[PDB]
Amino acid sequence: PPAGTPWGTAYDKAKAALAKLNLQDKVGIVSGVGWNGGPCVGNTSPASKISYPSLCLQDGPLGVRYSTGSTAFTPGVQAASTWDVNLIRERGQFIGEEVKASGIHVILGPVAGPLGKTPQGGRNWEGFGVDPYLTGIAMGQTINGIQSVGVQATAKHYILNEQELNRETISSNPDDRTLHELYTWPFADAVQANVASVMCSYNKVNTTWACEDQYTLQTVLKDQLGFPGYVMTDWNAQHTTVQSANSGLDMSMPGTDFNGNNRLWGPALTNAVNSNQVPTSRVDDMVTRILAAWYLTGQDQAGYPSFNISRNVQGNHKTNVRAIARDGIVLLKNDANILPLKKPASIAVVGSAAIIGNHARNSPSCNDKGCDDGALGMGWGSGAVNYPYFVAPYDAINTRASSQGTQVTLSNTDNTSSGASAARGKDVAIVFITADSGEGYITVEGNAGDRNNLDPWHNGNALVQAVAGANSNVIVVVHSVGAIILEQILALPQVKAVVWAGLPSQESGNALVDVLWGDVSPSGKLVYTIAKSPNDYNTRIVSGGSDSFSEGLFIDYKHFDDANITPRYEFGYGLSYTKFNYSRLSVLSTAKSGPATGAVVPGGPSDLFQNVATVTVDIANSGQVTGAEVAQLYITYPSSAPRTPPKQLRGFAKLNLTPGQSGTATFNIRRRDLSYWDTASQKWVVPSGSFGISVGASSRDIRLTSTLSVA
Ligand SMILES: *[C@@H]1O[C@H](CO)[C@@H](O[C@@H]2O[C@H](CO)[C@@H](O[C@@H]3O[C@H](CO[C@H]4O[C@H](CO[C@H]5O[C@H](CO)[C@@H](O)[C@H](O)[C@@H]5O)[C@@H](O)[C@H](O[C@H]5O[C@H](CO)[C@@H](O)[C@H](O)[C@@H]5O)[C@@H]4O)[C@@H](O)[C@H](O[C@H]4O[C@H](CO)[C@@H](O)[C@H](O)[C@@H]4O[C@H]4O[C@H](CO)[C@@H](O)[C@H](O)[C@@H]4O)[C@@H]3O)[C@H](O)[C@H]2NC(C)=O)[C@H](O)[C@H]1NC(C)=O
Ligand SMILES: *[C@@H]1O[C@H](CO)[C@@H](O)[C@H](O)[C@H]1NC(C)=O
Ligand SMILES: OC[C@H]1O[C@@H](O)[C@H](O)[C@@H](O)[C@@H]1O
């Protein structure tokens, strides 16, 4: 790592601190005390000689876990659905503040793995959607936000943990280009934003456990992407004392298995070094990397608060949760201006997802959010936290509707008769369906982490059907961990509006009325494809020992485009209460063909992240109300290049505009954004020829097109 740069400075302090330490101090730095051995989710032994504390590591990606005075931030997937980097950075900042104040050094997040290739994947919601570019930017933005507050971030999970089923035994075996150009891409962005830490995943990669694999840890992440920080195991994801240490692993978390066995480091590592099974330079390096993180985030300095998880650290962070839950809502359908609602006489609200249930209550049965009872705000597993409060859709609708004279009828179960009765007669009927998933150690309603199917939960399809048979103007509201097939719902001519609310967390109700009554126009867009049929997707949750990743670069919309399948709603699709005009598309480039030539800095060869071209378009609010548009750039590579997905998202801007108001969206093209991983030459290459430039409101709603040349 070069000097003058943040990492370089930290390594100097890290090398200097290493001198004062014995082997006993070193292995205590790298060895977890055990499963629940300390007061945090993770803990290591302190080194008092350098005033290095017992390192406190905690879940997770959306806030402080097991805390009684904490904010439950929206899942990453909601943040990405805003398409708003400012809200994304803020979210990471706000998480970081609560982590410092609660006395935790390392937050175990955010998530780039799984990327999310299979809609049934139980953990995708924790991430940033299916596109490596968007997810990449969001990793960058989030990590800056988190670490600028003085807390350590963890890029997670490295790598290819794209399903929950047999995650601890299944092998992920993609070809080299798929590995570099798709799944690693977002991880580069993380390394480049100077991420403190990287978590290696539970799965195997080409038959080798991820936390024991020389090639992914050493050659690719550490060497090729120039990651100066440290790699920790997922909880009990280490299988060896010796092999893991030599491969590139830096930290054994949490130290033991749940029963307190399989202690492969610590005393065993003290043995291994003595026999020179593990050299000394290797153990020095781990401790270097670990301490350099502690120095990068300035956690040595001043009075870092002590671990107190009952501290009220919320503040006014709910504003970020409000904004993201609200601006992350996608409007899928809206016929005959049914929406926004403008003071109707009566409203029917139908569904168990409409009201407070066990999920929103932090119920003792519903541990780790391991249930889909009542209103839904997130998935389950390690990436869930407790709700400090929860605003149920019904309650927020009730207050607002009542205030303006509207009467409300509630049918708060999923019963079809009650649903239809409540609907019949009323001016509109709003019905609430869900779908849930999570980490694959909790089975909820038969779903062992990953979803069994892509249908609504609790017979949501029948409920919509029942209500539609009793009312002409139906609004369907979905809160979901991922794509749900919507063809049955859409077949009902009575269904006039669908609202893809996503995962809103604690501010569910408010965000929704924000959009429903049109205090804000919806501006969210999809970060994954909603298909007409489950069959149209090209990936499966794999039940055998191996996923060959043979689909390669072609996942979600890249498959849909290439095979010419028409989705119901495409990636980057989203409606608005107003509309927008695109004009004056311009393209400027100085990009040159050939391999990346810069030396390796955090993120890879130095030129890869530097801008080489710029694309411009003017967006004008041609509607009658204020609203934000997410203008998107898609790139088609030249015909000289190998088989590459036809369109590839390479930029996005969001512009908020009053009626008649115009603005310029600017897309900065980094070198990588025109590159592909040439496997033969083992380098990132920009191809020569003519690139296609597609600019529009989605991956499919292209409005203007042009070209970009390479010599
Ligand atoms: C899981 O396993 C898979 C499968 O192994 C992993 O992918 C593999 O990753 C490694 C890197 O670790 C790559 O190795 C590199 O290979 C290139 C050459 O690549 C070409 O040949 C490949 C093998 O071809 C054999 O088989 C064909 C028939 O199929 C026969 O005709 C041949 O005779 C061979 O027997 C072939 O697989 C490649 O095709 C792939 O890529 C092309 C596009 O390039 C696609 O069209 C295909 O679809 C396909 O995916 C390809 O044609 C070597 O050049 C590399 O060695 C160089 O670089 C090293 C590092 O710098 C260095 O040590 C060497 O010295 C060497 O450098 C030499 O060359 C330089 C540049 O030319 C010179 O500058 C220098 O002077 C020197 O002379 C390297 O060995 C594999 O290609 C790759 N395989 C695939 C299929 O992708 C995957 O990573 C694993 N996944 C995990 C762990 O998650
Ligand atoms: C933890 O925080 C609470 C504030 O609610 C305080 O009463 C208590 O003293 C703190 N305990 C420790 C050990 O810091
Ligand atoms: O709770 C600590 C860890 O638990 C594991 O089961 C999960 O896979 C990780 O995402 C999490 O960080």
From TrEMBL:
GO biological process: cellulose catabolic process
Pfam families to which the protein is assigned, alphabetical: Fn3-like (PF14310), Glyco_hydro_3 (PF00933), Glyco_hydro_3_C (PF01915)
Subcellular location: Secreted
Catalytic function, reaction form: Hydrolysis of terminal, non-reducing beta-D-glucosyl residues with release of beta-D-glucose
Pathway: Glycan metabolism; cellulose degradation
GO function terms (MF aspect): beta-glucosidase activity
Glycosylation sites: 206, 308
Signal found in the keyword field: yes
Annotated keywords: Carbohydrate metabolism, Cellulose degradation, Glycoprotein, Glycosidase, Hydrolase, Polysaccharide degradation, Secreted, Signal
Keyword Signal: yes
Disulphide bridges, residue numbers: 40-56, 200-211, 366-371
Residue intervals of the Fibronectin type III-like domain: 629-699
GO CC, any one term: extracellular region
EC number annotated for this UniProt entry: 3.2.1.21
Entry-linked InterPro entries: Cellulose_deg_GH3 (IPR050288), Fn3-like (IPR026891), GH (IPR017853), Glyco_hydro_3_C (IPR002772), Glyco_hydro_3_C_sf (IPR036881), Glyco_hydro_3_N (IPR001764), Glyco_hydro_3_N_sf (IPR036962), Ig-like_fold (IPR013783)
Protein family membership: Belongs to the glycosyl hydrolase 3 family.
Protein name stated in the entry: Beta-glucosidase cel3A
Organism: Hypocrea jecorina
